[PDB]
Amino acid sequence: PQITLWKRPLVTIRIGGQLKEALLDTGADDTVLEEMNLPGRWKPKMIGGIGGFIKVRQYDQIPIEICGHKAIGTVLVGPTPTNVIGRNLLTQIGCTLNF
Amino acid sequence: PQITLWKRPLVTIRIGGQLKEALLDTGADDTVLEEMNLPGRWKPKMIGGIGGFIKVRQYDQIPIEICGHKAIGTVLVGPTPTNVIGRNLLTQIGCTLNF
Ligand SMILES: C[C@H](c1ccccc1)[C@H](C[C@H](O)CN1CCN(Cc2cccnc2)C[C@H]1C(=O)NC(C)(C)C)C(=O)N[C@H]1c2ccccc2C[C@H]1O
């Protein structure tokens, strides 16, 4: 689909049989979701943004459905202000910026 | 043009007669630029990102060019690690997200 930007680009995602809302974020290198439970082993990691750095849990090869399109990649979980879908998954679904 | 997301979507912008590299960020509601001495009056403001809030200076009706596309709007100036073009300006140049 084609998404305009007069409103935040939010979409529904399906992760672990759970529905959630996320922001399509081209300025984010990675994908971060609010604190939640995910199966599998996770490794501690730190990511920085405006404001500073935070500690997150890193899950690898996680299947995630974004607005109908399937993806499988790294998902970070931690105290983020909102669920963000980064470039690592945006590229998996063939997402581009146009103008 | 059409921009892929394999790399950070960086483009050239011109503001205050200066050429700078900026990140096209669909996840940012506002536009944030690295510290610079713009002329004109401004208002103090706090904006929050991944790891907290940073204090910035708000300049209104600032003319700015993004890849040869002229636009004008609000710009925040502060200690941001990188220049960020938010949705307030992306909409002006008819930028869309597509997949
Ligand atoms: C320019 C940022 C950057 C910093 C350093 C290096 C490159 C880019 C970039 C910004 C995010 O695209 C957008 N981000 C999403 C979450 N919400 C949250 C919010 C916070 C407070 C109030 N409302 C909403 C904040 C919003 C944001 O930072 N907005 C502004 C107006 C303050 C600019 C960002 O945070 N990037 C990092 C990043 C992000 C997620 C996962 C991994 C990584 C690594 C980095 O690429």
Swiss-Prot record, chains A, B:
Superkingdom classification of source: Viruses
Catalytic site: D25 (for protease activity)
Domain Peptidase A2: 20-89
Ranges for region Dimerization of protease: 1-5, 49-55, 88-99
Known role: Aspartyl protease that mediates proteolytic cleavages of Gag and Gag-Pol polyproteins during or shortly after the release of the virion from the plasma membrane. Cleavages take place as an ordered, step-wise cascade to yield mature proteins. This process is called maturation. Displays maximal activity during the budding process just prior to particle release from the cell. Also cleaves Nef and Vif, probably concomitantly with viral structural proteins on maturation of virus particles. Hydrolyzes host EIF4GI and PABP1 in order to shut off the capped cellular mRNA translation.
Assembly: Homodimer, whose active site consists of two apposed aspartic acid residues.
Protein name: Protease
Native organism: Human immunodeficiency virus type 1 group M subtype B (isolate YU-2) (HIV-1)
Higher taxonomy: Viruses, Riboviria, Pararnavirae, Artverviricota, Revtraviricetes
